[PDB]
Design an enzyme around this catalytic site. Sequence first.
Site, PDB file in Angstrom:
ATOM      1  N   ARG A  76       0.818  -1.196   0.000  1.00 50.31           N
ATOM      2  CA  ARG A  76       0.000   0.000   0.000  1.00 50.31           C
ATOM      3  C   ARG A  76       0.853   1.247   0.000  1.00 50.31           C
ATOM      4  NH1 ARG A  76      -2.029   2.336   4.527  1.00 50.31           N
ATOM      5  NH2 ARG A  76      -4.090   2.689   3.587  1.00 50.31           N
TER       6      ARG A  76
ATOM      7  N   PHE B 231       2.243  10.864   0.976  1.00 53.33           N
ATOM      8  CA  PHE B 231       2.105  10.367   2.347  1.00 53.33           C
ATOM      9  C   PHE B 231       3.220   9.360   2.672  1.00 53.33           C
ATOM     10  CE2 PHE B 231      -0.915   7.872   5.407  1.00 53.33           C
ATOM     11  CZ  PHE B 231      -0.111   8.193   6.478  1.00 53.33           C
TER      12      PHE B 231
ATOM     13  N   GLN C 105       4.189   1.677   2.233  1.00 50.51           N
ATOM     14  CA  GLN C 105       4.094   0.665   3.301  1.00 50.51           C
ATOM     15  C   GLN C 105       4.388  -0.731   2.773  1.00 50.51           C
ATOM     16  OE1 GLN C 105       0.408   0.934   5.475  1.00 50.51           O
ATOM     17  NE2 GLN C 105       0.648  -1.077   6.457  1.00 50.51           N
TER      18      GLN C 105
ATOM     19  N   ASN D 144       1.199  -0.437  12.327  1.00 50.23           N
ATOM     20  CA  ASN D 144       0.596  -1.162  13.433  1.00 50.23           C
ATOM     21  C   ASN D 144      -0.922  -1.197  13.326  1.00 50.23           C
ATOM     22  OD1 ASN D 144      -0.569   1.103  14.890  1.00 50.23           O
ATOM     23  ND2 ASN D 144       1.483   1.618  15.637  1.00 50.23           N
TER      24      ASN D 144
ATOM     25  N   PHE E 135       6.743   1.454   7.216  1.00 52.96           N
ATOM     26  CA  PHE E 135       6.515   2.425   6.157  1.00 52.96           C
ATOM     27  C   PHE E 135       7.653   3.424   6.075  1.00 52.96           C
ATOM     28  CE2 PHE E 135       4.774   6.047   8.683  1.00 52.96           C
ATOM     29  CZ  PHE E 135       4.488   5.408   9.879  1.00 52.96           C
TER      30      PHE E 135
ATOM     31  N   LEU F 241       1.301  11.045  13.395  1.00 52.99           N
ATOM     32  CA  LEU F 241       1.672   9.677  13.745  1.00 52.99           C
ATOM     33  C   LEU F 241       2.618   9.631  14.946  1.00 52.99           C
ATOM     34  CD1 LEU F 241       2.056   8.202  10.142  1.00 52.99           C
ATOM     35  CD2 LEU F 241       0.044   8.146  11.650  1.00 52.99           C
TER      36      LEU F 241
ATOM     37  N   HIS G   1       3.124   5.644  16.243  1.00 56.73           N
ATOM     38  CA  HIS G   1       3.998   4.726  15.518  1.00 56.73           C
ATOM     39  C   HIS G   1       5.429   4.948  15.941  1.00 56.73           C
ATOM     40  CE1 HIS G   1       0.894   3.305  12.642  1.00 56.73           C
ATOM     41  NE2 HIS G   1       0.334   4.425  13.078  1.00 56.73           N
TER      42      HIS G   1
HETATM   43  N1  LIG Z   1       1.593  -5.992  12.679  1.00 58.08           N
HETATM   44  C1  LIG Z   1       0.653  -5.395  11.920  1.00 58.08           C
HETATM   45  C2  LIG Z   1       0.856  -4.116  11.412  1.00 58.08           C
HETATM   46  C3  LIG Z   1      -0.116  -3.498  10.625  1.00 58.08           C
HETATM   47  C4  LIG Z   1      -1.311  -4.151  10.325  1.00 58.08           C
HETATM   48  C5  LIG Z   1      -2.408  -3.490   9.453  1.00 58.08           C
HETATM   49  N2  LIG Z   1      -2.318  -2.072   9.780  1.00 58.08           N
HETATM   50  C6  LIG Z   1      -2.090  -1.061   8.951  1.00 58.08           C
HETATM   51  O1  LIG Z   1      -2.036  -1.120   7.717  1.00 58.08           O
HETATM   52  N3  LIG Z   1      -2.070   0.081   9.586  1.00 58.08           N
HETATM   53  C7  LIG Z   1      -1.842   1.309   8.856  1.00 58.08           C
HETATM   54  C8  LIG Z   1      -0.538   1.910   9.371  1.00 58.08           C
HETATM   55  O2  LIG Z   1       0.105   1.452  10.328  1.00 58.08           O
HETATM   56  N4  LIG Z   1      -0.076   2.945   8.727  1.00 58.08           N
HETATM   57  C9  LIG Z   1      -0.572   3.646   7.585  1.00 58.08           C
HETATM   58  C10 LIG Z   1      -0.014   5.065   7.623  1.00 58.08           C
HETATM   59  C11 LIG Z   1       1.446   4.403   7.583  1.00 58.08           C
HETATM   60  C12 LIG Z   1       1.082   3.749   8.914  1.00 58.08           C
HETATM   61  C13 LIG Z   1      -1.515  -5.431  10.838  1.00 58.08           C
HETATM   62  C14 LIG Z   1      -0.542  -6.047  11.623  1.00 58.08           C
END
Ligand SMILES: Nc1ccc(CNC(=O)NCC(=O)N2CCCC2)cc1
Length: 164
Positions: free
Chosen positions: A54, A59, A62, A101, A112, A121, A125
């Site tokens: 993604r 932005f 990831q 996360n 990411f 964030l 994060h």
């Molecule tokens: N260990 C783990 C880590 C992430 C996930 C699914 N979570 C995500 O895609 N969260 C979006 C996230 O953390 N982002 C997206 C903005 C960059 C930070 C599921 C398990």
Amino acid sequence: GNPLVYLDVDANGKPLGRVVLELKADVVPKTAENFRALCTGEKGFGYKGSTFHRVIPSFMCQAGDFTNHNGTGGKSIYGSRFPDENFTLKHVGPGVLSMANAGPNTNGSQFFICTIKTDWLDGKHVVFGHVIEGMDVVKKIESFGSKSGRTSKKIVITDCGQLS
Ligand SMILES: Nc1ccc(CNC(=O)NCC(=O)N2CCCC2)cc1
């Protein structure tokens, strides 16, 4: 000192080049060690062959779900998930390397790379490194994302490892 690691990245099966990352083991040793070992593959699993699943222009990019290959998975070298180590480092600008996360204390392997300052964030994060070389490669990856995060090319970490 702090580890230097690399990701070699393809888009649609052709190489974009190399992203070199400094891991801030001085500040977040547990989080840096996880990423380092997942790059070398020394525990028998890791980022080699996994995707940037993604990517959102202006932005972040990831990656790192090597277990389910869809954004729901990944695991750490410690177990499936590990705690937020600290929030000392901030999402200061392009090139920041930080843990993805699913809420507090759910770090696994997903990560990411920011392409802009992402201050909202901070405190949520764990930041654990920065791009040393290869922002051009990161901008290419970014250019293949979309508002929904869906990538328009298949972006693969073909090789990865440790430089020092
Ligand atoms: N260990 C783990 C880590 C992430 C996930 C699914 N979570 C995500 O895609 N969260 C979006 C996230 O953390 N982002 C997206 C903005 C960059 C930070 C599921 C398990």
